[model samples]
Target chain A: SVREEYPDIDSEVRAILLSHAQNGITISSIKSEYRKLTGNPFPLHDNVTDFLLTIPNVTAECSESGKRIFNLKAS
Target chain B: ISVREEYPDIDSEVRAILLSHAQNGITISSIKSEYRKLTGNPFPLHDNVTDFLLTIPNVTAECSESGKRIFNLKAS
Candidate 1:
């Protein structure tokens, strides 16, 4: 909830972020899509996970690429 | 730079406060307030809080009531 302005569009972002959820969703990708959809910066760069983390069975780790990426927790 | 966790992790303290207040259903605002009260320091103010939680387990949150959110300690 750190970033708003998207409202119920949360699911859309969640789905998109999960699309890359395995290899991990990068902030850059989320940022790009956020702009394309809302016409604004995501407002919470690495912090977007604040909302995404609401969903269970999902987790994140910084990639060897030096960015945050989410992955499906096998648990 | 964003911090994740540290030795003698603060998450332990935060979770302790949360579990202590779980019966009443706590909110982030309340959590922050209580955290400050207990630690004599402000709450984490972490950008990747939930993300950090992902690295741990047995704690969960929900907003089943809408506008006012709720936090709980997952049954351990």
Candidate 2:
């Protein structure tokens, strides 16, 4: 698992992810580069999905292999 | 950029030399060394400036008297 400095995340991206997840948006695909570029251990799977659930309008989709991707929509 | 077995971007002729330095993790210094070996120029100041800019999203600038002057996005 890669380690990341949580404080370094851009707040705008964070808010987008949170809002989408809380609204039960489902994800179509996950990008492998997200983890490599950001050095995030769980960039698109459990970590992001779990975090988004706490927001108001987002949800995620899971792959057969158990990878999670997120999508957003209006509540 | 020190070349490594894992670097898919390396072209054929430079692979050996780059791989030699890339046995360890690639750091900023290794990249500078690689540029010198390949391009035969001490890596230019512009290269240094661009590299530094890549890691920083924003910067704060101060005026001569130490009062904060401005904040802006870092551009290479």
Candidate 3:
């Protein structure tokens, strides 16, 4: 049922990320947001992170604690 | 001085160094140490290793079992 609703997880996630593009988004934040949006927990870090790498003009900054801080490329 | 301005090709140089150690990944300190060895001067005080590594695509930083942070190429 959830799979049928989220035919394209990548695109859905991308939209959520773009909404928060002005302020960077983290995995923890994304998990909560995704749950609110889809009524399902976000996928694992590796899966989401691997998807992020494929998007253009997005930056994934690793912090001191190894948390990835993601933001869009500044115009 | 900004490392980018000082060494315009530093990204390429750093990418090569990271690739050389791709199998095991490299520690932040080791990355800086290697930079010092690569260039005559020490790594710039203004530049952070994590910040610099982040700019390179497919580079992931994670904590090893020993609790040390390391950078490695994301697996295909």
Candidate 4:
């Protein structure tokens, strides 16, 4: 029934990420934060990453370790 | 007098990112882009990245047909 209450996981997840968008954060940190709020991994790094790339003025980059980092494009 | 010298801590930041996203090998382009994000300038670990990656156990650095480098961590 938990999923029932989270009918809009997409928006919920997006909001959580935007909250951390000032400096952006690593994929690892994003997953940990999502797990902290919802008790599970985001379940779609590839898809989630793809979504991020599609957003205007939002860019994701690869870090030295290989994790994709996301941030809101500078104004 | 190198990029690292100009942007200290960038190496560790990159390494941390790679270890964090080992599931997907990162592209040098992304690494370069991230360098700018952190330091407002481009960067490269080109001189030592290959040897350093080779030393890491189960790490694979694949070279594409167009000279693109893709680094991935083998499942362990």
Candidate 5:
């Protein structure tokens, strides 16, 4: 659990992700939401990406803006 | 912009998700969560989700535990 290295960041990220579950969210939005919710910039960590991928039903794709967006897998 | 404006295909998408769970009733939260999972955006808040679900022919509602509403297809 990334919770060890970053106690609540994992849950913070998950919350933002779930908030926009229907409309995919981008790294930009994720970081923004992180700052808004946690009052700190999202840490730049490779583990973060790995953690993102580890979430079941979560997938990543390039958005129309060419930025990477994470989304829950569609039903 | 309205939720429908932002997500024109939401109706169909929601319907599909509901139909997938036809055997067992689904909760409104689950439907919204699943909708978000599949579509990448929360189901529009302005729209009446419950009303929409009921609009589906054969869909019925029941009082589940704690007065929660469970929507399901009429058993064939």
Candidate 6:
């Protein structure tokens, strides 16, 4: 239901979402950077995790060295 | 005596990346690798270099003792 809206976001944005999800970036950091770059807070929602999952080209994987890496295909 | 001092002619992309790392946080290992990877320069620079660069007005170190160090934004 919520996924039906905002379908036009770009791959870069999706990549950011994926990286944010995979690495667990602090909300404060995300909020601060988002505001600094885009001048807005992340849209509030009950299921933020699901919202993050809806983006394309976003995957979470562990590198061969065992470090968690967020793989985001660049635009 | 700025970060720019080390690489005066750095390109925009590298500069932006460095600024982002400064603004956000990057591990020492990552910083060293990225610096070498991007610039092809050897490391082994003094720890004081990192300390100096990080102390710039808007930057500060978070947890930098006994190994689990991190850097992040400072409150205005």
Residue B63, model 6, lDDT: 33
Model 5 C-alpha lDDT per residue in residues B25-74, reported as the tens digit of each score = 78889988888899888677655555455444555555444455666655
The DockQ-derived docking category for candidate 1 is incorrect
Clashes of each: 0, 15, 0, 7, 10, 0
Tens-digit lDDT track for model 4 on B1-76?
A: 2555765676576666568668766776776676678667556565655444434444445443444556656555
* lDDT tens readout by residue for model 3, B1-76: 2677877878877787788888987977887788788876666644456657866677766544465656777655
lDDT of 1 by residue, B1-76 (tens): 2453343557687778877986766777787788889889876665545444434455444433244445555443
TM-score of chain A of each: 0.59, 0.34, 0.71, 0.61, 0.77, 0.44
Candidate 5 chain B minimal-lDDT segment of 10 residues: B58-67
- Listed for each candidate, the true contacts retained, as a fraction, are 0.02, 0.00, 0.09, 0.00, 0.00, 0.00
Residues A1-75, model 2: lDDT tens digits: 212455444343344455445432233322333354455543434444334433333333332344344444334
TM-score of each model, in listed order: 0.46, 0.24, 0.50, 0.38, 0.44, 0.33
Q: lDDT of candidate 5? A: 0.67
For residues B1-76, could you state the per-residue lDDT of candidate 6 as single tens digits? 3445665653343334457675556665676677777767755454454344333344333332333344333334
Tens digits of per-residue lDDT for model 5, A18-44: 899888787777888889887888875
Between prediction 4 and prediction 6, the one with superior lDDT is 4
Which ten-residue region of model 3 chain B has the weakest summed lDDT?
A: B61-70
lDDT of 1 by residue, A1-75 (tens): 443665655666666666665565665777787788777666655545555556555545544444556555443
> lDDT (CA) for every model shown?
0.59, 0.37, 0.69, 0.59, 0.67, 0.45
Q: Model 5, DockQ value?
A: 0.01
lDDT measured at residue B60 in model 3 versus the true structure, 0 to 100: 66
The candidate maximizing TM-score is 3
Q: In angstroms, how far off is A61's CA in candidate 4?
A: 2.0
On a 0 to 100 scale, what is the lDDT of residue B42 in model 1? Answer: 74
lDDT of 4 by residue, A1-75 (tens): 333555566565566668887867766787788888888767664545544443445545444565556666455
* Model 6 C-alpha lDDT per residue in residues A13-49, reported as the tens digit of each score: 4545565664444334544555665565655445442
TM-score of chain B of each: 0.71, 0.31, 0.77, 0.52, 0.74, 0.53
